[PDB]
Amino acid sequence: GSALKRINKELSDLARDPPAQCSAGPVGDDMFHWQATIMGPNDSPYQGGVFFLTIHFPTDYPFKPPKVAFTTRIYHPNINSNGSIKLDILRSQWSPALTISKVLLSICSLLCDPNPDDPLVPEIARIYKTDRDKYNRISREWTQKYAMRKESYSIYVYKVLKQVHPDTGISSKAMGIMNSFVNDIFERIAGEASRLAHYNKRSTITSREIQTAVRLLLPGELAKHAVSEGTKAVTKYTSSAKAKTRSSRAGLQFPVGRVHRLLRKGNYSERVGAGAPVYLAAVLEYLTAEILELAGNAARDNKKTRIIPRHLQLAIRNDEELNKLLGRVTIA
Known part of the structure; x- marks a missing residue:
């Protein structure tokens, strides 16, 4: 236009x-x-x-x-x-x-x-x-x-896959799709959280607005487990010692700092609390674990040891809740 x-x-x-x-x-x-x-x-x-x-x-x-x-x-x-x-x-x-x-x-x-x-x-x-x-x-x-270059998470996708299916790989084309899923979820959650922040006249996005967005945009069990994973991560991050890495303090494979930076870089709000990126990072990791577990399980019915774009299409279509979430995302 x-x-x-x-x-x-x-x-x-x-x-x-x-x-x-x-x-x-x-x-x-x-x-x-x-x-x-x-x-x-x-x-x-x-x-x-x-x-x-x-x-x-x-x-x-x-x-x-x-x-x-x-x-x-x-x-x-x-x-x-x-x-x-x-x-x-x-x-x-x-x-x-x-x-x-x-x-x-x-x-x-x-x-x-x-x-x-x-x-x-x-x-x-x-x-x-x-x-x-x-x-x-x-x-x-x-x-x-x-007054006082799409992001890629190949390492962390790989790290989660090694946790869920140690003996299954993922093709380059499959990994690109993963990055599309993670980026879309990031954009949609952050976008809604931004909406909520502006709506209620809040200058700081906290885990509060991240949860409400999740509860509204994720369907059924996905939202319930996501909210549970985000809460468990924020609880562990607060109690955990300050010496270890933000991701480690939350028990997550995904990078909190990178998410936190992106939350700022995206202009979603004036400020961004330290809990918000942990929560979103946990939410992103869980969904990645879910998608990878299904896709790998899908790659197993066809006797394959490497996830390809096809197995990703299958894992989403076979799960009602995921297909409601990832229907629009393209899958070549």
Whole structure:
């Protein structure tokens, strides 16, 4: 679609020469929903703070303006508690010629030079005009008080397979599918968790939002066992000593740090608790163990010692719950 491609080009343009004091990227695999971070302009009382914004592209982009709003509380004549930004380009003076990079730069200038004559919060716009010292001081108070290549898991898939079926291998084509399953589950769970975080106005994704997403997106026994594996992992991670590896502290084969990084890298939320990646990592490992156990069992009926894409198709189709989860994923 034109909207998508236009969005993808701006990202490419933004990626090469990012805007000063700014950065933006999609949320998960959703190109129509971005997260943006602005470093406190040096020529402003907001210096030192990191402000988080949300961006939503309409279907008719670039012929319609993007919906931009602050998720971090800020004190400004043109920004209200809803994060709404009164800026001419955002609504009145939209043009397809503008870019998200230009928008963000126009917002930065707005923080350096407010427009108190066309205000969104009158009290702030009055304090700004009559007592600039009071405005600058409160701004810093708020700044201080509020603004402070598909992934591959071949090793861990291999490690789980060695636990479940020590004498069964997996072809390269079968391993690629595994990576597709793990990445899809990651995207869908994280995506939902992000939704829940924004929905309830939470700046940190914790194991709480990871569990609710699992309980909602996984069917029947898969969800019940998944929730059990995620809980057992988070319990072991808290009690276990700090000296050993995050994955080891949770008794998992999958990498917590990598998941934790991806949780941040994906812009699913402003922050990500330390429990969240453990929970998701445990959930990812369990499903991998389930899929690999069935596939290997499938490779055995045909007297094969190496899982191939066919045995993966079979293991999913033979299990009602898994097929409900992995039906859409392609299997060549």
